[PDB]
Symmetry: C2
Subunit: 325 residues, 2 copies
Amino acid sequence: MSEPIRVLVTGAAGQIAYSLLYSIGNGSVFGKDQPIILVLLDITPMMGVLDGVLMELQDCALPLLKDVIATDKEDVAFKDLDVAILVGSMPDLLKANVKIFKSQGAALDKYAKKSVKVIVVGNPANTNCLTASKSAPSIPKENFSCLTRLDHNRAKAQIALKLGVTANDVKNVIIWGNHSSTQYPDVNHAKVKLQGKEVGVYEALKDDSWLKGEFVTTVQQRGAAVIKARKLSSAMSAAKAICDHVRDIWFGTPEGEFVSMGVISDGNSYGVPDDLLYSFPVVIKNKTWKFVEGLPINDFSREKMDLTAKELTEEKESAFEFLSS
Amino acid sequence: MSEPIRVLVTGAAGQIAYSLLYSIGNGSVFGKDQPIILVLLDITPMMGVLDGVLMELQDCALPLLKDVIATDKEDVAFKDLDVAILVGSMPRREGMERKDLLKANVKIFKSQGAALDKYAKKSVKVIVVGNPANTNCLTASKSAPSIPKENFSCLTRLDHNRAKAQIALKLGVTANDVKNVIIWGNHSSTQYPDVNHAKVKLQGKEVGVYEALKDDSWLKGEFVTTVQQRGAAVIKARKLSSAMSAAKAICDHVRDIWFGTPEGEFVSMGVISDGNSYGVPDDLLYSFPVVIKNKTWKFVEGLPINDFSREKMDLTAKELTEEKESAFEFLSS
C-alpha cells in the first residue's frame, strides 16, 4: 500500500462529480494499491447537497477512501494536493470564470504541492486552465492540462460505429485545439483493427467526405446532442473521460498510442501560437507528457488547426482583460 | 472471453440506473472476461432520455459492452435474459415512507414478473431494487412461477454497507474491516441492523463488534435508528435518492451472486424465506445472512438470536406480512 495521495474535486455537488467520485475512491483511477484522501469543494449554496454526497461516499464502504473532506473554503480544498480536478465553473460569463480560476490558481500557488497535477474540466476548459496556470506561476506550467479526452473518446466511438468494431480498436485519433465547437477531430494518423489487421482510418472508411464533414460536425455537436436528449449533463461519459485522462497521466500511455490533452503550447512544432492552452497529441511516461513530434499536417488539417487556434486566442485576449480585475 | 450475457436494467432513464450502467459495462460486476449485452427499459416518454444514455455509453468506449438495447416494451426488455435488475419504480420524496409506494409500484412488478415468466431464461437472476423492494420482489416471483423462487432477491446490501460504515466510524477502522453485519427483514424503517455476529479487525486481531465498542445502548438504539433513517437523510440533503451508493450496493449484491461470497464472510440479501430456521414465516421475501457459491445462495444457519434480536426480527416479519396482504388485496381488484 502506497502512502496516501490527496485529490481535490471541485464542483463536487454537481453532476459530473457525482459520476466521478466512486471511480476515484474505488481504485480504478490511481490503482488498487493507492489510498486516497478525497477533498470535495463546492460553493456555499451547495453545501447541503455536498453533505449528502459525503454520506453516500461513506455508504459505499470503500477501503481505499482513507478520508473525505467537504468544504467551501479554498485554504482547505487546495492544501497539500497531489491532484486537483477543477470541474466547477460558472454555469459576462468569461469575466465570472476568470474570477473563479484566478482565485483557484492563486490557491494552488500557495497551498498545493508544487508537484500537483491540475486537470481542468469546467467550461470553457482551455481558457479556464490557462487562467489558472497564469495565476499559479510557482507550479510548472506542464502540470496543467484540460480535458479533451471526452471529445477524443467520442471521436473513437463515431469511427467504431461506421466500421462495426469496438471503440478501443481505434487508436491515435487526435483532438486538436479548443474543447469547443471549433475542435478538430483528426484521423489522418489514426489506425483501426479490422478483421485482425491494423489499417488507416481513412482507408477503412473509404468516405473522405464523411470524415471531413459529418464526422467533424457530429463530434463538435455531441455534447449539445446529449444535453438535448437527457436534459441533464453528459456526466457519465465526462467522468469516464476524466478517469482516462488522469489514469494516462498516472500510469503512462500504451506503447504506440498517443492521446489528446489540452496542454501549454510553448515550443510546439505545429505552427500553433505559443502561450495557449491547446489540445495536442501527447505520449506520457513517468507522469510527464511530451508532444508527438513529426506528424505531417495536410492542408485540410492545417486550416482546421488554425481556426481553433484563432478561437483560443480570442478567448485569451477577452479573458486577460479581466485578469488584473 | 465468455459468451455474452444479457443484462436488463429497468428504470434505465432514471438516477440509480445512471450511476449503475458504467459499472456493468466496464466489467467490474460480471468480470473482465464477460461481454455484456445491456438491455435498458423505461416508459415511452423517457425514450429520448434513454437515447442520451445510449450516446453516453457509446462515448465511454467500453470494449465489453457488446451492444445496448433501449426499449419501452416488455417483450423486448425481458427476452433471453441472464440477469434482470428491476430498478424502475416511483421513488419516494422527502417525508414519505417506502410503504407509501406499495400500491403504486406492485402493479408494475406483477407485470414484470409475468414478462419474466414467458420471455426470460429460466435461469435468470432477478434483483429487485424499486421500493418497496421486498414486497415488489415477492409480487414478481409469484407472477413468475416457472422461474425458481430462489432466483429472486431484493436489495438490502445498501443497508448492509450503511451499517458497516456506521460501525467503522464508531471503531475508527475502514468499513471493509467490518464483516458479518446482518440486515434482517424488510428494506424499511423496521429493518434490523444486527451486529451480534459481526467482527472487526482492530490492531491486527479479530474482535466482536459488541466486545470492541462496549456501548450496548448505542448498538441497540442510535445505531439502529441511524441506519433505518439513512435513506431519508440522503433524500433530504440531495433532494434526490441515494443513486451513487445504491448503485454500488447493487454491484456488490450482483457480484457476490456471480462470483460467490468471500471466505469466512456472509452478506445480507432479501430472499424467499421458505424453510428458514430463524422463526420467520414462510412465503415472505425477507432479508437473511447468506453465503453464495456457484451462483446459489444458502442460509447461514446456527446464529444465536437473543431476546432483543428476536423482537426486532418478529416486528419486521409482521410488517412484511401486512405489506403482503396489502399487495395481494390491491392486485386482486
